[PDB]
Design a protein around this ligand. Sequence first.
Ligand SMILES: CN(C)CCOc1ccc2cncc(N3CC[C@]4(CN(S(=O)(=O)CC5(C#N)CC5)Cc5ccc(Cl)cc54)C3=O)c2c1
Ligand SMILES: CN(C)CCOc1ccc2cncc(N3CC[C@]4(CN(S(=O)(=O)CC5(C#N)CC5)Cc5ccc(Cl)cc54)C3=O)c2c1
Ligand SMILES: [Cl-]
Lengths: 300, 305
Amino acid sequence: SGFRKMAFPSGKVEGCMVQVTCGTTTLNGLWLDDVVYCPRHVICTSEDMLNPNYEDLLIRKSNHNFLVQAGNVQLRVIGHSMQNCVLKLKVDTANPKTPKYKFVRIQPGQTFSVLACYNGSPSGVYQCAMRPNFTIKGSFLNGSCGSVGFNIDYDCVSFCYMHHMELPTGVHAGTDLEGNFYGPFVDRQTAQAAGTDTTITVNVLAWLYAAVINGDRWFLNRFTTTLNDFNLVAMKYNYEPLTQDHVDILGPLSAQTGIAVLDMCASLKELLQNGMNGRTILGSALLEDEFTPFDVVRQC
Amino acid sequence: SGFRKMAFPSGKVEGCMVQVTCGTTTLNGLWLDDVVYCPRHVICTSEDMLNPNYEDLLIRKSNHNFLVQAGNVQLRVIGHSMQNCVLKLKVDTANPKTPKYKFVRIQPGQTFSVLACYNGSPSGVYQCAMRPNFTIKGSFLNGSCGSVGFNIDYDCVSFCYMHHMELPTGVHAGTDLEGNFYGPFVDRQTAQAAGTDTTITVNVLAWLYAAVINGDRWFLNRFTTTLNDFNLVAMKYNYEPLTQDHVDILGPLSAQTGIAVLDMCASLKELLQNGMNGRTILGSALLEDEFTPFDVVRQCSGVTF
Ligand SMILES: CN(C)CCOc1ccc2cncc(N3CC[C@]4(CN(S(=O)(=O)CC5(C#N)CC5)Cc5ccc(Cl)cc54)C3=O)c2c1
Ligand SMILES: CN(C)CCOc1ccc2cncc(N3CC[C@]4(CN(S(=O)(=O)CC5(C#N)CC5)Cc5ccc(Cl)cc54)C3=O)c2c1
Ligand SMILES: [Cl-]
C-alpha cells in the first residue's frame, strides 16, 4: 500500500555524468560509449546568447578548447560535431559504465526521472512530466544544464530529455538527445514565454484509479457522461481534451477496478465543480496529473 | 528555480541489493563487504509469524537453507547470526561494489531516500520522513521487505532504515540496520496500530522559507510571536512543539531570506488559524512537512555527491 511520486533508480545514469568546460562556461555532459553529449550553448558567452551563430562559434573551436572531466580523470576530445541544439564530443575513451540505452522523444503528459547534476556530479533525483505547454516544472539551479531525464523500464535506459534553459516563470525547457527542443523554444536569450499550461486529464484519471485501487471511493458518483460533454466541461477548467486514445489507454485500469472510463470522467467533473470539501485523495488536496496510466499500473 | 521532493542518487545502494530466499519466503538483503543484512522474519512461515521464537527457528537452520542471489550469481552462505530484528548472513564473496558507509539511527522529523526493491532488484527511489509516530508513509507492495532507507553525506552512505512491515492504515514500520525498530512495533503478526500522528513543525517552517526563496511571499505579515504563544497554538492543531534547537537550526534560512524564525512562526500561526483561502504554496494546498531545514539548504544550493 501507499502511493508516492517515484523516480527510477539513478545508478545507470550516474555512471554517465561528466563535466564539460569551454572557456568560462561549465555544464554537464552525458558520456555514452566514446561520445559526450551536451547543450551546444556551452560554446557561448552570456552576450552571445542574444543572437548566437553557433556554426560560426563552433568553427573557431579546436578539440583541446573542450575540457571534459569524468570524476577525477580528464577525457581527451578527439572530434566534435553539432546535431541540432546538442554538441557531440568524440572522446578517446569509451565509458566502461555505458548501460543498455536508447534515445526516445516523448509526448506531453509522459513522465520521466531527472538526475539533477552540477559540475558533472549528481545531486538529486526527482520525477516529473512533460507539460502540455512542453515545459517541465523542474528544480534546476545555474550549472544544471546538461542534466538528463530518462526512464528505465527493464534494464534499458531511455534518455528523453537534456536540460537547456529556465524560462521567466521559473519553468524549464530542453531537448531530446538528438538536440530537438520540446516546444517552440530556442537556445537563444529572446522573448519566449511558456504557453498557458493545462492539466493532463488522462493522468488525473489514472491517479483517481490509483486511489480506488488503494481503497478510496468517496469521490465516485452514480453518473456517467458522454466524451464530448466531459470535454466541454473539462476545457472550462483548463484541462486538456480527453481523446479516444486516452479512453483506450485507461482500459486496463477500468477493468481492474470495475469503473468505466466515462464513469470516472463523471467523478472528475464533480470534483472540479465541488472541490474536495476538506478531504484528500492519496494524501493530496489537489488533483494530481504527473502519474501516467503506465506509472499507476507499475506502482500499484 | 523550482522545488521538488528530491531523493539522493541511488547508485551506491543499487550495487548492494540482493535477493534472500529461505524456504517459501523471498525478500531483499543488503550486501556490504562479506555480510548480507535482511529482516529476521525471512525464517518465518505464515503460521510461524503468529508467535515466533526466533532463536528456536534459527537454531534449526543451516547455512545452505538461505539462498542468496546477487544479480545472476548465487552467493554462498558460510555463517549466520541474529542482531535484534536483523539477520546477518556471512557470505563467501565480499561485495566489490561496497561503498563507504555507516549505520545511523535517525530521529522523527528526519528525512531519507528509500530504494524500493523486489526480488533483489531496485524498482524505484523516493523521499520520505520518519513521522513523529515512528511510521513512514512509504510505497511498498508484498516482497518489498529488506528495502533500505539512506542519506548520503559527501561520498558516505548512511543507512538508516530497513523495511519490515505494513500497518492496517497503509503506513510502514521498520528497523535501523542494527535491527532496532523505530516505534513500539514487533516483527510478529499481532494487533499493532500506528499511533496518532503530528505535523513536523520545524519542517513546515523550512518549507515556508523554501517558498520565500522561490518567490512566494503572500503568507508573510508584519507580526511576530513568542515561542511560548506559538507552541500554545501548535499544540491545538496537532503540530509538534517547536524548541529553541529548531529556532537555532532555522538560523541560516532566517538570514538568507531576511525573515526572523518567530516572524515565520506568526505566518504559520495565521495559516493554521485561517487556512490558505484558495491559494497554494509551492504548488501545494497543504502545509508540507517532509523537507528538513538541511534539505531546503541543499536543494537551494546544489550540493553534489
Ligand atoms: C541570475 N542569472 C543571471 C543567472 C541565471 O540563473 C539560472 C538559474 C537557473 C537555471 C536553470 N536552467 C538553466 C539556466 N540557464 C543557463 C543558461 C541560460 C541563461 N539564461 S537566463 O539566465 O536568462 C535564464 C533565467 C530566466 N529567465 C534566469 C533563469 C538565458 C538562456 C537562454 C537560452 C538558453 Cl538555451 C540558456 C540560457 C539559462 O536559462 C539557469 C540559469
Ligand atoms: C494480500 N496481502 C494481504 C498479502 C501481503 O500484503 C502486504 C502488502 C504490502 C506490504 C508492505 N510491506 C510489508 C508487508 N509485509 C510482508 C510481511 C508482513 C505480512 N503481514 S500481513 O500478512 O499482516 C500483511 C499486511 C498487514 N498488516 C500489510 C497488509 C504480517 C507481518 C507481520 C510482521 C512482519 Cl515484520 C511482517 C509482516 C508485512 O507486513 C506487506 C504485505
Ligand atoms: Cl511518450
